[PDB]
Amino acid sequence: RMTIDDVGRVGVGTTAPTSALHVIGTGEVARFVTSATGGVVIDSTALNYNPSLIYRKTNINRWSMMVNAASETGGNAGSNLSILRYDDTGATLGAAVTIDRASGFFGINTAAPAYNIHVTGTAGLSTGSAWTVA
Amino acid sequence: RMTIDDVGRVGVGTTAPTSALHVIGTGEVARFVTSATGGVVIDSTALNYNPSLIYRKTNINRWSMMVNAASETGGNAGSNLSILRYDDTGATLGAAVTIDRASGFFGINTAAPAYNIHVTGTAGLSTGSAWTVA
Amino acid sequence: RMTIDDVGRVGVGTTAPTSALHVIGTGEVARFVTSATGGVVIDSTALNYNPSLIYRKTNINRWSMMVNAASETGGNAGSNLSILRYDDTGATLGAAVTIDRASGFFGINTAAPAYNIHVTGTAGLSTGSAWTVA
């Protein structure tokens, strides 16, 4: 059920691990329970590396939420959040969503959003053509 | 503290692990660091098994971000990214957000987004009633 | 490159574990594979402890997806979903995205969205000034 490879890779549910930690399971594979506000951290060793949460089917890329390598030039620039989609073979089809760290601007199909919501494409509303002035 | 049960469930910080990996902590329960792009890869062994990140409170479903089981019919159709909300007992309230993998279309309360942003219901904007022509 | 220490924290690839589980690897780092719909669960032990997925860079907060601190007072109130952003020194900068658990309302820069999409700020659309009635 659990093995440790010569290079240094820990496999749970498998004897041939592919990652540092490789867990095989049914249903809830891993459960991380905290006695306080917190959870799982995805960290990087350098600001030019991208911490990613990657959703795969049949080990083929499908979706991912990551912190991109936009450089931190000062004033909270760079390291923005992006939700990326991938084709049926695992090659990136582009950032579906991008949130800028410094401004919080939410871009749909937009790499550099200049508005609080910035949509590049078409917009559909089920109830009318105008926003409601909140 | 660390325990390896007979069925094959590794419990870190607990003796009765319910998942294949079951980690218990305070604050930072788990930390996954990368030296490139990666961190947490959620994979499934078949195209009709949905890889999910599940947020729970007192072991009751609150939220989830997953790749749904929409049929991959070709041309990057299917396997879309859904964010789901659950009621106070943990039962699903529906996909609050759905992004199409083929198109990148972003549906808010819209299971079949037809526009780059597609909202079903009301739209509220603090700064007026129209989109700014970008 | 796998140790257990006094406080019983398991570290993989490190010998100084700082969390209950601490993994560092080249690339993927941790892969959770499920044989059925399921994946990783982040849980808490009380309704006021908030499960979170925290993206850091050099162990400094950059982004967050977490169940927020709104009080569960009945009718699926409270414990909304939040995408938070942090400044260059890891301090909270603001909740970019907030989804109401009870209503599914999607607020951009709005902690209590009162519309299916509630935007506090400006809105830019590439194709025009108006929604397309769906």
Author numbering:
A (entry chain C), B (entry chain A), C (entry chain B): 648 to 781
Quote the authors verbatim:
Bdellovibrio bacteriovorus is a bacterium that preys upon a wide range of other Gram-negative bacteria, entering their periplasm and consuming them from within. Proteomic and structural analyses of vesicle contents reveal several fibre-like proteins, which we name the mosaic adhesive trimer (MAT) superfamily, and show localization on the predator surface before prey encounter. Structural studies reveal a variety of domain usages (and therefore binding capabilities) at the fibre C-termini, placing these on intertwined trimeric β-prisms. Using independent but complementary approaches, we identified and characterized a MAT superfamily of trimeric fibre proteins with diverse adhesive tips, able to fulfil the long-sought-after role of multiplicity of molecular recognition and handling of diverse epitopes (across a wide prey range), by the bacterial predator B. bacteriovorus.
A C-terminal region (amino acids 632–922) of Bd3182 confirmed the predicted chaperone and protease activity of the S74 domain, yielding the expected two bands, with self-cleavage at catalytic residue S782. We generated three different forms of the mature ‘tip’ region of family member Bd3182 (we describe the 1.1 Å form herein). Each face of the β-helix is formed from multiple chains, resulting in an intertwined structure. The RMSDs indicate that Bd3182 is a true S74 member, with a surface cleft similar to that of others, whose exposure (via S74 proteolysis) is necessary to bind their O-antigen ligand. An AlphaFold18 model of full-length Bd3182 reveals that trimerization is retained along its entirety, generating a fibre ~550 Å long. Thus, predatory bacterial MAT protein Bd3182 is related to phage adhesins but uses a distinctly longer fold with a more exposed binding cleft.
